[PDB]
Design a protein around this ligand. Structure first.
Ligand SMILES: COc1ccc(-c2csc(NC(=O)[C@H]3CCCCN3S(=O)(=O)c3ccc(C)cc3)n2)cc1
Ligand SMILES: COc1ccc(-c2csc(NC(=O)[C@H]3CCCCN3S(=O)(=O)c3ccc(C)cc3)n2)cc1
Ligand SMILES: COc1ccc(-c2csc(NC(=O)[C@H]3CCCCN3S(=O)(=O)c3ccc(C)cc3)n2)cc1
Ligand SMILES: [Ca+2]
Ligand SMILES: [Ca+2]
Ligand SMILES: [Ca+2]
Ligand SMILES: [Ca+2]
Ligand SMILES: [Ca+2]
Ligand SMILES: [Ca+2]
Ligand SMILES: [Ca+2]
Ligand SMILES: [Ca+2]
Ligand SMILES: [Ca+2]
Ligand SMILES: [Ca+2]
Ligand SMILES: [Ca+2]
Ligand SMILES: [Ca+2]
Lengths: 342, 137, 342, 137, 342, 342, 137, 137
């Protein structure tokens, strides 16, 4: 049980203990990154190299110990059993990231001491806090849900960028600015300007000079800034709708009977293959039994899917149609019984 | 192929070439399951490929074509067992599994519960690895 | 059947074969565009002209062959039959784009070799990947759905731009900057600055200098940047709602009976015109029959439209009202029968 | 014009100047179609211009005014045939068309099915071009 | 009838005739504005003054005639009758705008000829196309619906701007840039920079120089750009939801019975005041009658409001509860009748 | 009653009197802030110091009187009774802000007179208008509702910023610009540029010079501007959905019976503890009574929560299932009674 | 004030101090309107201030307090007449008004229709200005 | 602990080890409350931890475990009293409280109303501080 408790405390935070542990680790990583920035500053390197090295040694030892204990505790779940299960757990990208960071830091500190590794490893280790993927998983789910509109937006934006950049390049190909430098010397420079304008940054290093270029830039800016800022709005509305449906979902006590029925039907279908078994409690009759069990499995799977998915107007109308048909059938039975009596 | 026609005709019992809700209910009553009209309608909807309202032989053939070993089906069974599984781990007590199978949802009897626990807990332990159980299935 | 298979593989991709074919074609087009950019760079033209010419010849031959085979395979669908059907297919904008690109490339390479055609044709041929219009069609549908609010936003933004630009032009008409150049020399320059500010680019070439101009620019920026960035949010929310309703739509097995009923009613109405026909199986009676068939056609069309459209609360309430009226009528019948009996 | 009053009065049978659900149902029963109250209500809703609940002579005139040859109606028929049409092409087998017409949705008999296939497949082939069929309609 | 037709053609466009008329008028106004811009350009004034004057005379005559005919045709509707009705119509802001433009143009051309009127009048007359207010009305409705969140956003943004601008002013109060000019010479300049940054323009004329200023600017930018761009997203989502509910609204044939009932109940309540009237067809009894008529009026008003408003889940549940109560009451009546019989 | 009226007029505005009072106070504060800006301007200090001092004295006296009267009137509500209740009211952040502003202004004017207090106190006192927290409370509620997606967006944006800034720093570490200054002299400067670009400001002081840097900046800008502008869209959609659900909420007359039932059940549960009480009107029986009362309390609490929460499809389906079960049970009872009779 | 108690007690007829759906229905039946349970429930909901389910004397007092001449009520009547008004103008034919009043929605008789048209079309013309009619109301 | 089994068995009356809707309704009828099937179903749903449809002894134990003094419960009672409280203040008249308790929602009798007002208005004043009342609870 201690293995499960430590695995929960190290990978699936639930209490303020795990919260403060992760917060302290992230704060230490951020402090090390800030000291790396100070070292990269040309005037603050000699007074920071020693403390950077010491903090790097302490942090690499700490992360090695953390990775070892996490590997030991990963065996709590049944999916990770033995050497093969531990390898399967380590194959996960986050574990791969941690292993790569650990080995790179160890080899860098063994070699060392001016090197870019002591900084790029901090850059990559700032990513270690994304445990369980509770952020990247959500982002990927939303992007995959909206992939069609996202691709449409990207394609329209890129095509508009290319066309307008070429038009502006044709407009101001020979427009010498005040500083005696060609603002648009080549289609590459024009494309850089187009990217800047569509991204709505406006560095100002390259600005159109001729009136044709100014007019084209204005029209294309007004008609393409919306498209190149569209993904922000799309993802925002997607996130809002997703959280609304999440707060509209049914409670977890409405899935238990459906899961039970699904498991029972699956077990019945599995046992139908074996001729001598206890499942034969209510040749051709055996085939009918297995077909009926398959149908029960399918209907149980559909019911479980509908129960898991948040309630919908289609579910409401289906349920009402079922109830209305039941009531109509029973009323017809009462009517025919009354007709028989009289 | 040949058995599909015999099985389809077995539910027919009238030679009309089409299976309906009343026909399936009569077959179920003869078998001895005592179903309800809601269950009959749900089954007909789930097996009805086109959705006209009845069951045809091509629809029965398609239903036979779709079967187990699907990755989606295995994932569904896995997450259902996970929902039944407390502590977020992959292990559930044999007593808890027996209780939930015999009470919650569909009802099961002693012999089938014993067969289920025998097939699940292959080793002499009080826990069952549902991942390996599904993989064995 | 081979004609249909090749048409599907060339215009309606369904498998990884078609996916990789289109990906390779798009990648080749992008590589040719990048080499055209390198050629347009003044220092990388002599070493790139020959490879650009060779790649252009290869690509024009490939696209000519692709267009020929697509024209041959377009006859699979019944809409394109014979010479007239092939012409109708070629009249489609994408086919027109491909034909124009092919003929322009052929004539350019026959004339050639410094020319802007070898680059503008690549710019236009980057658009060839938009097969079936699965992107432009969606964009046009959403824009046409939101046309009223989009026009409102465009009009408000343009009017605010014009008014604020004129006010700033009046404010800083005679404000000489540090570089001894009139920042706002004319209403044209002031309008260019206004466009830059409303589009939220901020090139910085033209910046107000007097405090009145600064105050007006600040107030108008705060009160008009939202309006000139509004279309991004509008289109994003529209895309999100459209994809939500798309994922909420009913399955395709709920449209078949409605389509069958619509076709049957249409055929009955068509056959009602012919006096001697098999449709006369259950003068004035003929008129009543044709009127009833017309009513059946109308109700079938409405039912099909409702079935195709995603389920709605109005559909739910209509269906419940129908069922409740049925139940009330049958209960009234039972009540009157019981009263008659007793 | 004159026939509209006679047709409207034909459904009346009581001279009250207004058509109701019960009146239309009685007319349908006399014709021999055996309808239901839901169908009657749907028809009354579809022909009722104002939506009060009954059918008036101006509403009947408007219903007569709206007729076939509409571009929207042709598009609807075209996409319905496309939904019935597999492979995404414009051709469907005559046997499949016969089966779907005689079983799915509304029921049709042998003579009307034969007339439909004769009017659709003008040439001696196993496929029907629904685009040309609708254009002929 | 001709008066109504011309009023519809001039103020409520319905056909392509009115569409092309308004398009031509707007295009002429835009052409005049472009020529005014050319005249404002210092190098293109002598060749444009004469044509500007001639076009201004033609356009002022045309707009005077249009205003006269619109005033004559405004009497079609009952709201505008006689001199008082014409004055009430002219009191509308659009008519006021047209009258002001006409009189200002007439007086300017009578005085004239270098004047700013011949340009500001064009600027204001570009607004004349907003007939019926079908744009400003929608914008005002949405803003009034979202007023609470809009005020919250404005207040938070303004407070953040003020606080961060003061902090940056304290940070870089004495930071001389390379050009030997105080980037932040006063809190006014710091506030201008803050407005630029929150509006996400980035002119670059004023940029922080000290590291404290850079850090504060970065943090405040990341934490306040979202708030100062919030109104765009709010209004976009509001427009999208409004158009979705507009397309979800019930047909116009479901409001007629409710309007009829409301009018009848209002007339009954009005006639209840008169003692001798035909409304007395089914002292204390009169008071009961008038109270019942008042209750009928209230319930009819509520029913009309619910019918006009788009269908809602609360309407669905209310209607189902009513139907269920009716069915329960009738079943109870049948049960008691059966108990009495047996 | 006068105490309650003055408390309402001073803290919970309801009428035009309170509206104009708050508007006048806010306008006076804004005027004082503008005069402070003029004083901070180096050329407009001597002519503004005296009026700033006089206005500060008047405003501090007015705010002291307002705070005293608000403290006196805070005793109307039962939550604030006696010295402890007044202290509890003063512990509220807005009261703390007012007290801090008052004491700081008094001490500053007693010390004075060049000081930054006479300006920072105005900056902080511009916040005093946010009475009742009707803005910050809404903002905090929405942020707490969307916390998961907001944290995801912040983390993804920060990680992308760090990685891309490091890549650009590696690209253009030794790229001397035209002005002979290192555009990217250190990772700190590169990170400042990255923050500017992701926030989409584009000051232009630091711009990439090498083509590798330009390409990396373009790609990262296109792929990260959406993420760093995401919170605007998220909060906008959240505000729109919140106001839609607010306008969809049920009337306040549907909560009264639920509140009554909750209070009655709570009182019954409380009185069940006392053995001798009037609640014993319909040992082991006492335990059954208290268990039943606890169940009634729980069901009443759930019903009140559902009634307070806006109507939902899950509520609709639950209510329909309850009604259908009731109807089925009663029909079964009628059927069994009829079978018994016959 | 005094008449309110008498009017409230008039609907009572049992001295319990509270008005219920059954009581109001019995009063309506005695008057001779022949109402329905749905109408009774809607009226009780519309007059029930708190929403408990019955009608109290304070609620009756509040209902009496809220009355006509409200700007919202006038606007509602105006837009209802506009919906009845074709051509978007402010004029409707007297014959069309008579037809809609006598057929659509609530039913009216000849005498009340004549009074309505007399009060609306004060001048001898075939059109009625509903704006002025409402203002007169 | 021991009393929980006795209380759970008290509702049983049949020794089956499970409590159902019919069993609880029979217990309530024996007590003399005269409940309805909707109330029974709502109570079973509110006490049913898993949601299978019946009440188990572990579910009864959990229901006993969850009890009063919860901050959420106190907040709910406070805001309910605030909703009952006009003027936005914390004081309500004793007469108004008596009227609402005896009429609106659940019905109460004179003795229990007197006990409630005695426990609420400890001091001889016409107002009750519901905050202090809840704190005393
Ligand atoms: C506030 O003022 C407004 C008002 C309306 C909009 C708006 C929304 S959608 C939309 N359609 C567009 O922007 C589409 C379609 C209409 C023409 C312009 N394009 S293109 O540039 O993408 C483009 C560029 C280059 C190439 C080769 C193809 C396509 N225009 C934006 C801002
Ligand atoms: C975060 O801080 C905020 C708070 C609120 C908003 C906001 C939303 S909607 C709105 N109404 C507006 O922006 C409208 C209506 C109010 C006055 C300003 N205009 S005008 O410029 O278009 C404009 C400009 C020129 C002319 C000739 C006509 C109209 N103002 C924006 C940002
Ligand atoms: C992508 O990275 C992100 C992640 C999260 C957000 C985000 C959303 S809401 C929010 N709360 C805010 O921005 C609030 C509340 C938290 C502290 C900062 N403010 S304050 O500046 O307005 C502000 C400034 C000055 C004064 C005197 C008062 C208040 N921060 C934005 C971008
Ligand atoms: Ca059959
Ligand atoms: Ca079928
Ligand atoms: Ca096991
Ligand atoms: Ca009739
Ligand atoms: Ca009608
Ligand atoms: Ca054919
Ligand atoms: Ca009563
Ligand atoms: Ca009441
Ligand atoms: Ca009149
Ligand atoms: Ca039991
Ligand atoms: Ca249970
Ligand atoms: Ca008290």
């Amino acid at each position: 049980n201690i293995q499960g408790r430590v695995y929960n405390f190290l990978e699936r935070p639930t209490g303020w203990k795990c919260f403060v542990y992760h917060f302290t680790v992230f704060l230490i990583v951020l402090i090390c990154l800030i000291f790396s920035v100070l070292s990269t500053i040309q005037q603050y390197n000699n007074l920071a190299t020693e403390t950077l090295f010491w903090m790097e040694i302490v942090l690499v030892v700490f992360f090695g110990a953390e990775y070892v204990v996490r590997l030991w505790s990963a065996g709590c779940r049944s999916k990770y059993v033995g050497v093969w299960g531990r390898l399967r757990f380590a194959r996960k990208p986050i574990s791969v990231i941690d292993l790569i960071v650990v080995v790179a830091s160890v080899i860098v500190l063994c070699v060392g001491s001016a090197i870019r590794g002591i900084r790029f490893l901090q850059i990559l280790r700032m990513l270690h806090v994304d445990r369980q993927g509770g952020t990247w998983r959500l982002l990927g789910s939303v992007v995959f849900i909206h992939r069609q509109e996202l691709i449409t937006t990207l394609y329209i934006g890129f095509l508009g960028l290319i066309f307008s950049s070429y038009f502006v390049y044709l407009a101001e190909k020979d427009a010498i600015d005040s500083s005696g430098e060609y603002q648009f010397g080549s289609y590459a420079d024009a494309l850089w300007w187009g990217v800047v304008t569509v991204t709505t940054i406006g560095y100002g290093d390259k600005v159109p000079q001729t009136w044709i270029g100014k007019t084209i830039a204005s029209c294309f800016s007004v008609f393409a800034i919306s498209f190149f800022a569209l993904p922000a709005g799309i993802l925002g509305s997607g996130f809002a709708l997703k959280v609304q449906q999440k707060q509209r979902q049914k409670h977890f006590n409405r899935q238990i009977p459906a899961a039970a029925s699904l498991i029972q039907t699956a077990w019945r279908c599995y046992a139908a293959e074996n001729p001598d078994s206890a499942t034969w409690k209510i040749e051709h009759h055996r085939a009918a039994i297995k077909v009926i069990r398959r149908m029960q499995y399918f209907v149980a799977k559909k019911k479980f899917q509908q129960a898991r998915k948040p309630y919908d107007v289609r579910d409401v109308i289906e349920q009402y149609s079922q109830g209305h048909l039941n009531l109509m059938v029973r009323i017809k039975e009462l009517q025919r019984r009354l007709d028989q009596s009289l | 192929i040949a058995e599909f026609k015999e099985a389809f005709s077995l539910f027919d019992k009238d030679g009309d070439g089409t299976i309906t809700t009343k026909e399936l209910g009569t077959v179920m009553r003869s078998l001895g399951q005592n179903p309800t009209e809601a269950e009959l309608q749900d089954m007909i909807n789930e097996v009805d490929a086109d959705g006209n309202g009845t069951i045809d032989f091509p629809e029965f053939l398609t239903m036979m074509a779709r079967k187990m070993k699907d990755t989606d089906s295995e994932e569904e069974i896995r997450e259902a067992f996970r929902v039944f599984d407390k502590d977020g781990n992959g292990y559930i007590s044999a007593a808890e599994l027996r209780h939930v199978m015999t009470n919650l949802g569909e009802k099961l009897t002693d012999e089938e519960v014993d067969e289920m626990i025998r097939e699940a807990d292959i080793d002499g332990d009080g826990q069952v690895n549902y991942e390996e159980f599904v993989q064995m299935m």
